Design goal:
The PDB classes it as transferase. The structure is cut from a larger assembly and holds 6 copies of chain A, 1 copy of chain C (about 60 residues) and 1 copy of chain G (about 30 residues). By secondary structure, chain A is an alpha+beta fold. Chain A is built from 9 helices and 5 strands. Chain A has a 3-stranded mixed β-sheet with strand order 1-3-4, sandwiched between helices. The longest helix of chain A has 15 residues, at about 95-110. Chain A is globular. Chain C is mainly alpha-helical and about 60 residues long. Chain C is about 35% helix and about 0% strand. Chain C has helices at about 15-25, 35-45. The N and C termini of chain C lie far apart (about 40 Å). By secondary structure, chain G is an all-alpha fold. Chain G has one helix at about 1-10. Chain G is rod-shaped and about 75 Å long. The chains are: A alpha+beta (about 240), C mainly alpha (about 60), G mainly alpha (about 30). The interface between B and F is large, with 81 and 106 residues. Strand 5 (about 190-200) of chain A pairs antiparallel with strand 6 of chain D, so a sheet runs across the interface.
Chain lengths: ~240, ~140, ~60, ~140, ~190, ~525, ~30, ~100
């Protein structure tokens, strides 16, 4: 799982044009480089070590527990490439990990506790995973899909009439985020602007994997008094006040 | 040869015409913008018919937004897509609450077998004399020979 | 596509031969050597069916 | 897919989107599956690449859209890739097990450069050019060895 | 779990054919698919149960007992039960006891905050402004025993055991039983410094 | 008048005259000269029991067809079964029309796969009008059981897992080719085809009758469009083709004499020459020659129109009074000894081709010898093979004035740039490799040169080699297994196939997950 | 080493769909 | 075939049709090959086809009409195929 991340991290710095990660410390103090990457399960193959492979008295490495930890992927990154002493906030968001990660990563920089942040998500696919996803009847029932005459490539069909269960996948995604000011001084490429990132619980439920409409609270605004235009929206107004 | 192939569960259904209308309109919209499809083409007629067939209120609203919010000044192509657009709107407004139609607007072509200098045999479908619309097709069929 | 240098005799007016290539491929003016082409350049310096290169291209074991 | 379509629609409705301007939905999972952890990050990667190209990849696996999803005016479901003139902002929405809502808004990068001077921009461009040549070298170097 | 007495198994090889035992049709076929040539199965005509002749060269797991050396832990006192605080049985059996710890801890904290009904918060504050930033280092450990070990032993385990393995779901159950917030949720892993 | 269009000068003004209904006072029925038979015409049964041209019937038919060309035909509330509508068929072109008119259609395929699914998906996404639906089912005309199940599957209620329809039209066009099979060579193939092309179609008409009689539906007949041939064994080598196509003509008599006239109607389509696609499908070469006898050959779209002509509410009424035979043949009846004349037109083209070929062969050799290998080996140019220049796809940075147009001008020095979050670098490792490779598959659905090479390098199929490769010093790509040199051109041909199998969403490969 | 490299150089030197043949038409058979 | 209309067409009908058309063709098939084998080009066998004029005028005859009408193809295939020297066709339209 970490191997996924390491490659993803390196290639991201290459996509950022940063060949030597130490170059960051020309501009930025050691304490201002954050790693807010996270997972939903983490060291799944390490757990196969712990619960199963030990029980079978197969030879397993002593420190397999440390590879089971979710935060240690981010640690290996900092332990092999980064050498930062900056913050580290490793989120769990089983499916929405990456978004949560971005939210935090932003919030780390808006404090000024970090100026550059490594961000994104990762999870692996293993034996016990697929079976438990199977027992929650969440994944696509392949045998039923073969009965419907479907081929592998077309088994993931979002917003479809005939949609039935998802397709479990492995891999890792990494993004690098900065203060615009710093980004412009470093002469790094700029791919876009993170405008808004937020997270949202739902309500009282009795079903865990049931998604809720909570995130609507990105769009909250009051409407009893909407007869006349607000000057707060007008850039003309805001500019003059500055 | 006589082996069973049919089962109930393999049956794929297609019904979401409402969704394809917007997409096919949107595809066409940008194709004109990059200068792939021009005024003169028969594609822009045939595609229109399919959109006019699939006309409902939402599909007007969709067309009303994307056409009324172009800037004509940026490119020659942007003027063209507005002019086509405004006209295409007016048609769809009339064909609303009217049964859709099979109309074929394809160029009537004949066979031409060409033998070059080296004796290579080439076949190509060529525009005929006097038959350029299915109007003139039906007359030709009636008049015999 | 086909070559712009058909015969090597075209190089006898070398300035005009260079310009012709780099007008068709402007990217080549604004980009460092691919490491593949670096090694190919050095392998062609060792080509023995050829008067040896009158410069030093690289510092390595073979510098001597 | 029902829930996510519903919530985006209600966002667009409450904030008074012009009637006939649907948001366009890309469904990356159709091609990539569900990397449950890394879900948003790939969608993030995708969104960025969409912004810097003006290209919208359709859901090629979408043979037929659920009749239920017609009621959501402000959402559009493409199948083929849509080559546009530009994209301004992209919404990213992931839904996690155990009530884990999340929305990210990512904005076209050229909007940033507006807020600075000619001088700092021209200074920036020269150093990015310096990055690009240096980056190209190291990557292809590190690749082949 | 007695740390002086740790259940573990060794992969061994059968030297001589075993004596038949009874099992269901389904069960027998599961053996046959595993071992193939190294097992035979037969319909016992009267019952409709199947005999299982496990043969020479087959693979077996025999339990054995490791004598382990860390016998002491800081343990929540004997007789502690989620029952006594007010948690109902339907909730207990469904959920990893790690959550039970949290739920009690959460309630008692609101009591320490003087908030008896958590809904009281919404007199002052909008639904979107109540966050749960609680977290773990490992999380649903007992759920993982479900997944990796207890399934493998074909012991009856609840289907949705995976959702109790997730670290964030403890915080979710809090919001799913008490809070009803639509505010943020940021669940950190910091194994020791969580 | 001859109606003036705006077609192939300005298609903004023939987009303007599509909803406009054209009412014409002089019908094309009166345009029909006496002593002359039109190309398209209906036929009427004589007391003798043969099929003569009828003026009156044909008139009504062509009038409907004239109206189809101008205002068009609706297929709303028409339930259609169709078979043999494969890619590049008349069937498919008929299907297009039905969907364009808003018909609800069941299409039957043989080679049910991904490629075929996507094809019919493409069609409904382009032509499918409002109220139109399309159903694709895998189907074997040959199988009795499949026929009985399919008809049941259409008419059974949605609640028992059916369609709950009632068909208005049946087009049983499905059939197979028989080539070089004369009387003596008649065997398995022949009988099976005949079972498809006659028996099961009867059984299909059989099946629909029973299911309609069951529910007491006496007043909604389905119109069966019989594919007729006029060339009932004029050609030979067609095996049991003729026998099948002639046997269908029994339906024109059984409709009168049996008790199924209220549940089905017969509309026999005598199909003429239709040119296929725009390549040398063996018969397109001689089409031109045949038209110089005052014959007319048809395009796929033209013949489709003609068949869609048979579903116009006027001829719908005729089917429901009398059997309707439709001579949709451009006078191939009237060319005598059609086999011999065919083969003559092949000959005169082959002959003319062969002589001009053999001259071209000698004028190459009688130019070779003269010029040796000095004006035939110095004529060859130098071709350049492309190689992989993988780019990092950094954002194109426009000049300053091409940024200030975009953002409003007031924004300058307004924002704190220490409180703006910017994505600086991104990457992924996925079932489609890197972010670059994934994007190409996501957006384009096929790898570029750069794509393939990167993917092959990732998947350990190629690796770079510098130094001594079997003595000869080599610089370039090398197959990771065979240690054979590879160039970027070949990568597509050698690896892509292998890459698409073992990349992305696929069957679980136990090697990657420890068995 | 040159002797080794010279040495190793000298050890090399049914379709019922009418998609293929359109036999609904009288012409497609062979005619 | 008695009391078998279109809907009631089944096993019986197809088998009879196999007798009344297919095998007769195959029989004419068989004789051609065996005559062409021995190089007998000048001794054709005369096939007396039982014809009906009532091609489905009656109904309830199942696949009788279809068989009896399909035989009329032989009057055209005799011209257009290479078996004219080994067989000849003599269609007998039989009355009451």
């Amino acid at each position: 799982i970490t191997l996924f991340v390491l490659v993803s991290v390196v290639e991201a710095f290459i996509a950022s044009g940063i060949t030597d990660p130490y170059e960051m410390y020309k501009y930025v103090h050691v304490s201002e480089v954050g790693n807010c990457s996270g997972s939903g399960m983490g060291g799944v193959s390490a757990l196969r070590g712990m619960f199963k492979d030990r029980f079978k008295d197969e030879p397993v490495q002593n420190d397999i527990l440390q590879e089971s930890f979710i935060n240690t992927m981010s640690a290996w990154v900092n332990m092999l490439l980064i050498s930062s002493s900056g913050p580290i906030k490793t989120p769990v968001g089983a499916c929405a990990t990456s978004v949560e990660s971005v939210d935090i990563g932003v919030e780390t920089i808006l404090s000024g506790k970090a100026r550059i942040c490594i961000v994104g998500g990762y999870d692996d696919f293993q034996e016990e995973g697929s079976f438990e996803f199977g027992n929650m009847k969440a994944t696509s029932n392949t045998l039923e899909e073969f009965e419907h005459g479907r081929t592998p490539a077309e088994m993931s069909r979002p917003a479809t009439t005939t949609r039935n269960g998802f397709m479990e996948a492995q891999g890792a995604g990494i993004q690098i985020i900065m203060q615009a000011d710093l980004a412009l001084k470093m002469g790094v490429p700029i791919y876009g602007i993170v405008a808004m990132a937020a997270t949202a619980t739902d309500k009282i439920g009795r079903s865990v994997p049931a998604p809720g409409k909570g995130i609507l609270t990105t769009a909250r605004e009051h409407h009893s008094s909407v007869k006349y235009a607000s000057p707060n929206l007008n850039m003309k107004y805001r500019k003059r006040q500055l | 040869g006589v082996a069973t192939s049919f089962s109930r569960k393999k049956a794929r259904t297609f019904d979401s015409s409402w969704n394809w209308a917007k997409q096919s309109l949107l595809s066409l919209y940008f194709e004109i913008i990059h200068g792939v499809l021009k005024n003169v083409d028969r594609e822009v007629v045939s595609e229109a018919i399919n959109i006019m067939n699939r006309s409902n209120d939402a599909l007007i609203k969709f067309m009303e937004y994307h056409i009324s919010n172009t800037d004509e000044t940026k490119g020659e192509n942007y003027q063209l897509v507005k002019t086509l657009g405004e006209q295409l709107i007016e048609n769809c407004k009339q064909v609303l609450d009217v049964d859709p139609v099979y109309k074929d607007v394809a160029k009537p072509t004949g066979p031409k077998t060409a033998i070059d200098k080296n004796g290579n045999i080439t076949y190509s479908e060529e525009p005929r004399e006097k038959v350029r619309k299915l109007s003139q097709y039906v007359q030709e069929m009636a008049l015999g020979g | 596509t086909l070559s712009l240098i058909q015969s090597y005799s075209l190089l006898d007016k070398p300035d005009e031969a260079i310009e012709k290539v780099f007008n068709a491929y402007p990217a080549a003016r604004e980009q460092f050597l691919n490491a593949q082409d670096i090694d190919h350049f050095l392998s062609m310096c060792q080509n023995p069916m050829q008067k040896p290169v009158p410069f030093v291209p690289v510092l390595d074991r073979r510098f001597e | 897919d029902k829930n996510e379509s519903a919530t985006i629609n209600e966002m667009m409705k409450h904030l008074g989107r012009s009637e006939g301007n649907p948001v366009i939905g890309v469904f990356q999972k159709f091609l990539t599956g569900h990397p449950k952890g890394a879900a948003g990050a790939w969608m993030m990667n995708g969104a960025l690449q969409i912004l810097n190209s003006g290209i919208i990849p359709g859901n090629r696996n979408a043979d037929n859209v659920d009749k239920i999803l017609e009621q959501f005016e402000y959402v559009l479901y493409p199948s083929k890739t849509l080559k546009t003139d530009g994209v301004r902002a992209v919404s990213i929405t992931s839904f996690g097990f155990g009530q884990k809502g999340g929305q990210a808004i990512v904005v076209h990068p050229d909007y940033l450069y507006g807020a600075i001077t000619e001088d700092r921009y021209n200074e920036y461009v020269a150093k990015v050019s310096a990055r690009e040549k240096s980056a190209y070298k190291f990557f292809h170097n590190g690749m082949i060895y | 779990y007695n740390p002086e007495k740790k259940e573990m198994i060794q992969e061994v090889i059968v030297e001589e054919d075993l004596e038949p035992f009874e099992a269901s049709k389904e069960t027998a076929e599961q053996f046959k698919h595993q071992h193939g040539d190294k097992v035979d199965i037969f319909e016992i005509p009267e019952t409709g149960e199947y005999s299982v002749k496990l043969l020479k060269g087959a693979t077996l797991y025999i339990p054995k007992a490791l004598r382990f050396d860390r016998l002491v832990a800081g343990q929540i006192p004997t007789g502690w039960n989620a029952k006594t605080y007010g948690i109902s049985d339907d909730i207990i059996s469904q959920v990893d006891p790690i959550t039970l710890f949290v739920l009690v801890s959460v309630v008692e904290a609101f009591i320490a905050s003087g908030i008896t009904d958590p809904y009281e918060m919404y007199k002052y504050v909008h639904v979107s402004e109540v966050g749960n930033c609680s977290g773990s280092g490992m999380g649903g450990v007992s759920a993982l025993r479900g997944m990796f070990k207890d399934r493998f032993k074909d012991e009856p385990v609840q289907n949705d055991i995976l959702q109790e393995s997730f670290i964030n779901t403890m915080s979710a159950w809090v919001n799913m039983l008490l809070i009803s917030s639509s505010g943020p949720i940021k669940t950190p892993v910091g194994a020791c410094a969580t | 008048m001859d109606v003036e269009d705006a077609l192939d000068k300005d298609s903004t003004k023939e987009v303007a005259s599509l909803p406009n209904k054209s009412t014409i006072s002089k019908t094309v029925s009166s345009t029909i000269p006496r002593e002359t038979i039109p190309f398209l015409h209906l036929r009427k049964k004589t007391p003798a029991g043969d099929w003569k041209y009828d003026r009156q019937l044909s008139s009504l038919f062509l009038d409907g067809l004239e109206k189809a060309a101008f205002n068009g035909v609706t297929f709303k509330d028409k339930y259609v079964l169709i078979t043999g509508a494969g890619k590049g068929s008349i069937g498919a072109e008929v299907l297009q029309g039905l969907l364009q008119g808003g018909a609800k259609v069941v299409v039957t395929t043989s080679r049910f796969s991904k490629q075929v699914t996507d094809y019919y998906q493409s069609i409904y996404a382009k032509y499918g009008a409002k109220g139109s639906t399309l159903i694709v089912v895998p189907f074997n005309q040959g199988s009795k059981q499949d026929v009985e199940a399919l008809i049941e599957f259409i008419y059974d209620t949605e609640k028992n897992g059916g369609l709950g329809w009632d068909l208005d039209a049946i087009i049983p066009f499905a059939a197979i080719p028989e080539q070089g099979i004369e009387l003596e060579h008649i065997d398995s193939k022949s009988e099976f085809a005949h079972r498809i092309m006659l028996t099961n179609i009867l059984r299909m008409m059989g099946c629909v009758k029973k299911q309609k009689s069951a529910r007491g539906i006496e007043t909604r007949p389905a119109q069966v469009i019989l594919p007729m041939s006029p060339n009932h064994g004029t050609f030979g080598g067609d095996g049991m083709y003729s026998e099948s196509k002639l046997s269908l003509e029994t339906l024109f008599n059984r409709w009168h004499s049996e008790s199924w006239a209220n549940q089905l109607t017969v509309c026999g389509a005598i199909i003429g020459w239709t040119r296929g696609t725009g390549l040398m499908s063996a018969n397109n070469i001689i089409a031109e020659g045949i038209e110089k006898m005052g014959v007319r050959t048809f395009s796929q779209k033209e013949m489709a129109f003609n068949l869609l002509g048979l579903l116009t509410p006027e001829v719908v009424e005729l089917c429901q009074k009398s059997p309707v035979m439709a001579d949709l043949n451009g006078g191939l009846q009237f060319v005598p000894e059609l086999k011999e004349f065919t083969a003559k037109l092949r000959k005169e083209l082959v002959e003319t081709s062969e002589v001009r070929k053999a001259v071209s062969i000698e004028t190459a050799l009688e130019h070779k010898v003269v010029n040796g290998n000095s004006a035939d080996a110095a004529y060859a140019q130098v071709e350049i093979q492309p190689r992989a220049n993988i780019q990092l796809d950094f954002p194109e940075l426009k000049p300053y004035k091409q940024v200030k147009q975009i953002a409003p001008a007031e924004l300058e020095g307004l924002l704190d740039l220490e409180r703006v979050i910017v994505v600086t670098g991104f990457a992924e490792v996925g079932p489609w490799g890197s972010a670059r490779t994934r994007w190409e598959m996501e957006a384009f659905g096929e790898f570029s040169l750069e794509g393939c090479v990167e993917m092959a390098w990732i998947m350990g199929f190629i690796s770079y080699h510098n130094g001594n490769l079997k003595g000869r010093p080599y610089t370039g790509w090398v197959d990771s297994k065979t240690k054979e040199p590879v160039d970027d051109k070949d990568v597509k041909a050698k690896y892509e196939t292998s890459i698409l199998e073992h990349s992305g969403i696929r069957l679980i490969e136990p090697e990657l997950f420890n068995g | 080493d040159a002797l080794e490299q010279e040495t190793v150089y000298r050890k090399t030197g049914v379709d019922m769909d009418n998609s293929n043949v359109d036999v609904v038409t009288p012409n497609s058979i062979f005619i």
